[model samples]
Target: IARTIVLQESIGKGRFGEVWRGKWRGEEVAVKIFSSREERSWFREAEIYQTVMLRHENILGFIAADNKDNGTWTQLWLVSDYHEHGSLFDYLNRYTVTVEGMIKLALSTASGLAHLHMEIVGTQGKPAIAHRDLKSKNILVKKNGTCCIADLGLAVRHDSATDTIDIRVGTKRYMAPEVLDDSINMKHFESFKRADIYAMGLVFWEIARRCSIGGIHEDYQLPYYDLVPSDPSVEEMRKVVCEQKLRPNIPNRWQSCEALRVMAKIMRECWYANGAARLTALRIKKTLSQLSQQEGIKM
Candidate 1:
């Protein structure tokens, strides 16, 4: 394939760079060209893409990397099954899905995260991996109702010891208590997993609220927003997440839907103040599966 044309308009922008939709190898692909100051992050993301092969259908696929001779590497040119629908955040802003649609989206996301958490020993006996930063903004939704996790810039290998993982690196609102308190050093893997569970709970809440209310509302605010206040101190956020039992208000409209009721309860389990009390992603998956069975159809 020849060098692709660089379009001026950006499709999206992140902390590290801007994404553009362009043609590559005679097909449409998203080109993520990092800013000059974000060179290190660009390389790190590339390494993660290579290490964590696209084994899960819900994880984005990497097509190629663009390394130029002009002292600028365009990072990775990820060519996944593109969707005009875009990210879950964008989709929710424009469209409203049914109760069934929400469950399907949640299941797809859980399955992808579960795949990443697997302890897969390689042929060389390497350890497993985990995504330290899991959020709805990182989840891309396809037209077929499937969702995939994108932007592996902050993912870490399970066995690697690093100072960065000890500090909170994800979105503050979705961060778990252990992460906010800097208590992850003693129990890195478990703490990170619990943090992911909490984020998943937040995502679940987003889905449930949209499905129930048919759109975003003031009632869908983050848990403990009232108690902790916006722009909270780390200690304050820690207290809110650890010492407080913060939860989303269940919409009265969903009272009749038994599946919604069960979903609300399971989401609460994901956000348990005590890390030990939080449910595992596998458990969440099982509960969702059971709900599907009860509903007499696949989620």
Candidate 2:
């Protein structure tokens, strides 16, 4: 299947190698080429994608994965459904979103995150998976104005049978205070999910800032952009997040808009110093859904 795909152009690049816009079976798909050194990331991400009942509208759709050998080093390939709008970061940078657009993006993101964090109890049950790296760049924007969570290479799942939680650290900038200080509860699955909620809150801030409320919106900025330097190291982030006990600012202007007010409150709850005090993904999803209903915004 990897050989069948005809890479059209380079779409993006990341910790992996490069992602190409490809044609397969007369349809467009995203081809993520991984360097041989990152085989572990490729394999783990592919395995997670193949999990039972993992398919959802807000989750990236997996198509196929394979490795090609040309009598030398192997090339790992991961193919998935292609979204024309690209990552949420790119989208938000290009255009501000209306209230409905903002809610659609936020609500769909919460829906996807809730589904990932939920555990199914049936025989073919799905494990509770935590996305270690939850950021604007890891989310893809759909043409419908909704978004899908992607890049599960750093994700982990709790195996109820073995009573264990798989472990992984996330992007430094998005890491929670507990994680930054190396105090996160690695043994508990909920701790990982709570950390993800923290990152999700930061992501919501990114989305909310770009929201056009009363025809006014602020320039896009990553969480703590003004406080921390671009591409901050772990030490730098810990100093700002843990030692100083600071989180991203919520502009007073946000309180003027109902949706933004709710989003700001959610972000505050998520950025709590104590992980236990953070809201669960399901709870955040429910609140966002209710807000959508109140605003009469259709998904």
Candidate 3:
């Protein structure tokens, strides 16, 4: 399946490797190319996508995975459905979102995360999965304006009977206080989900700032642009988050807007210093569901 693809252009570069927009069977697809050294990461994501009931509209559509070594070098490729809009991070940087747009984006994103964290009760049920590296850049913006969570290279899948996790992956700026302080409980599954919720909260803040109403909207700013350096370290994040208990500034103006205000409240809940105190993904999903209906934001 990978050989049939004709690479067109390089769209983005990430930890795993370069991502190219490609053509396959006359249809466009996103091709992730990994060097041989990163074959483990490539295989992990391919296996994650193969999980039963893993495919969903709000989750990136997986197509194929192939690694071939004809002669000199091995080429590892992962193919998935390509969306023209690109990452949510890229989209927010380019244009603002309307209230309805904000609601749809938030709702779809939560639904995807909720599904990842949830385990279906069936013979072929999906193992509860935690996207250890949730962030704005990892989420894609579809043409329909909804989002699909992508980049599960660092994801953790659990089996209560026996499970192991070792990937300490996630953006430092989006790290939860417990994560920054190294006080998180890795043994428990919910701790991982709480960490993901914290990152999602930051993403929500990123999305909310660009929400436009009456031609008024804030410019795009990262979670902690003022206190930390552009590329902050774990120690920098630890001091700012755990020691000083500093969080991204919540603009007072948001209180004046109902949609933004509600989002701000949810963000706070998701950032609780106590991991157990943090709101669950399902809770956030239901909250946004109610907010969507109450605000009359289209689905």
Candidate 4:
């Protein structure tokens, strides 16, 4: 309730709505107010969050929803924990963090995705979930030095029986080849999982470039960069993603760092032209965990 909550503007906005820094019940919170009318299929967002019941620290915390006073029904309020550092996209543009810091951020994101992919159970013994639109913009960094996955709008439950999900819903540059091909048989959950992994690899590349080179190169830019394909035709996007071998250059400065080298190698594996060659989330999590342990960080 902007009229009642003393809302202040935050630095995030999206196609759905705007996020604001607000005080509710005398506590700091981030509020997401959805537009009065979203395009068809947008409402499926709230449903995915409700279905997953996500609550991991690395996953953005959902406080509650508001539909009070029956006011015009023009907006939906989603209250979540407040984070001052903003999105990873914003944070990277300002400063380059240490390798340990980058590892921590990557590990946090991977752990959160792992939780969604395997930890939370659904009715009939279904697995936790998959984030169809994993990207730097969808991730938030907190002041506490931890990062969390945000914007569950494009998520899908692992058990959904539908043959095809709403198409052309995610960012083109971050989409998996199968998603662009329209050949994905949703009957297999592994396909969806692999798609997510493919996107995650791209995200990893983004973080690697930022952490290692301080910024992305002009050619292999970040997701929202000027050359990024917003909504390319599926076949066109597939050609760029699968046949082009589009990849970010690894910084030579970090060549001596084993962790960085391993991460770079694995990120390349995740982007293999063939979806079958991409690493699974489970495998990704295991590799990250092993790295964490080697660095003496707790999982």
Candidate 5:
């Protein structure tokens, strides 16, 4: 996969390494090259991407994984379908989406997350998975006005027979109250799934803020932008999320738009202080799907 592709240019950089726009045959692909010390993350992410029955339209399309030795050092590569619109974070900052576009993006996101959290039982069954690092930047926007969940290095899988879960971590800013206070029940796999839903609420907020309704749309800002400093520490986040029990402010204007209003309600449900009280991904997906139908928006 590495030798055959021609690297075009660097697209973005992350904690793991730089992502490049590469030409594979005649098609464009995103090549994520891991830093030398991030071999474990590269391996784990690639492994998760190849899980049985994991393919879905709203999930990043995994292509191939390879490692190349350039004599001086070895380079690890994970290739996937490239989206011109980039991430939801980048797309939201660049343009305000119409009601239809916003609903499409939101519904697709929930669908992806629902699929990830669902377990399939069969000879080719897929274990329930949790995206520990769910966030706006980790989701990419396709040209078709929908988004795909990406960056699964921190993902974990649950094994029902043994009742065990793979250990992992997540971003600090999007951490749930339980996670921030170190009170999450590691024994229950549902805890990790609930945490992912909490982060998804923040991502939905980011999407909602950029929706243009009645010719009004707010600037794109990360969740808790007004409360926490940029690159906040875990302690700082814990104080705000757990101690103060604060959540992102939902503007009053959102109530004017039915789509935004429903989304706002869902976000609040997702951010409940008790992880078990939070809405499940499937429930969110069904609600949004119904909303799309109500708005006459076709997926």
Candidate 6:
């Protein structure tokens, strides 16, 4: 699979490595190249994506993984479906969304996360995976206004038989209160899933702020953009997110829009200081699904 591919322009970079737009047999794909330092992350993401029955529209479509060596240095490659709209972070920075667009994006995101959190109980079962790094940038926006969750480098796969939990890490900015305070129950699988729910709420908030209706859109900002410094330390985030007990500011204007109001309620529930108090990903997906009907967002 690696030999048949041709690299193109660079798209972005992550801790794992650089991502490029590439062509495989004349079809476009996203190529992620990992240095030796990030080889494990590349391998982990590859393993996670290939989980039994893990494929979904809301998850990035995985194609292949390869390790290339020229006798001097080794390079790891992971390829997936390419979307020109890029991430939700990139898309929201430039384009404001309509109510329909907002619902599509939010619902699609929730659906993806919910699927990840679900445990399949059968002979052909898929493990429940926690997206330890759920954030706007880790979510890719499709041209149709929906999104696919990406970046499985920090994901933790669950072993239902033994009930073992993996301890992959997450971003400081998106950490749950429990995570920020170092009080998260890492032994319990539910705790990690709840923390992911909190991050999903923040991702929803980022999408909500960019909603446009009759000239009433707000500028795009990261969650806690005002609460901490750029590239905040965990200490900085802990002070604001854990000690001060602050969440991202949800605007009053959301009440004016039915879809935003419904989503606003869900986001708040997801940010509860007590991780157990937060809604599950399935609940969030169901809530958004119902909200779409109430607001007539037919997808």
Reference-based lDDT, each prediction: 0.69, 0.91, 0.89, 0.70, 0.91, 0.89
TM-scores of the models, in the given order? 0.83, 0.97, 0.96, 0.83, 0.97, 0.96
Candidate 5 local lDDT, 153-177, one digit each (tens)? 8888999888788662677899889
Ranking by lDDT: 5, 2, 6, 3, 4, 1
lDDT of 2 by residue, 216-255 (tens): 8899999999999999999999999999999999988898
The digit string of per-residue lDDT tens for model 1 on 1-299 reads 21554443468876677787776555666777775567778877777677634467777777665554344443434333455677777776666667677778888888877777655556544344567767777788876787888887887666643423322676676677778877665445666677788888888877776774445332334445567677567777767666675565667666667767877887878877667788887777777777776656455
Lowest-sum lDDT 10-residue window in model 5: 163-172
Top TM-score: which candidate number?
Answer: 5
lDDT per residue, candidate 3, 180-298, as tens digits?
88888888788898899999999999999999888988899889888999889999989888888888889876887899998999999988898788888899889889989987856
| Worst lDDT 10-window in candidate 1 | 159-168
lDDT of candidate 6 over 187-242, digit per residue (tens) = 88888899999999999999999999888989999999998988888899999988
In model 5, the Cα lDDT at residue 234 comes to 91
Candidate 5 TM-score, true structure as reference? 0.97
What is candidate 1's CA lDDT for residue 103? 78
Output candidate 2 Cα RMSD: 1.3
Over 1-299, each residue of candidate 4 has an lDDT whose tens digit, in order, gives 44466577765786577788999778788887776566233456556556535667888887776643346665667777888888877877776755667677778878777877774434544345778788888899988667899888877665344533433567777777777766776666667778887788877777766565444332334743433455556566666655674555566755767777878877888877667888776777788878878877544
User: Cα RMSD to native, each candidate?
Assistant: 3.8, 1.3, 1.5, 3.9, 1.1, 1.4
True-structure lDDT of candidate 3: 0.89
Clashes of each: 0, 0, 0, 0, 0, 0
- Could you tell me the lDDT of residue 80 within candidate 4? 79
Worst 10 contiguous positions by lDDT, candidate 2: 161-170
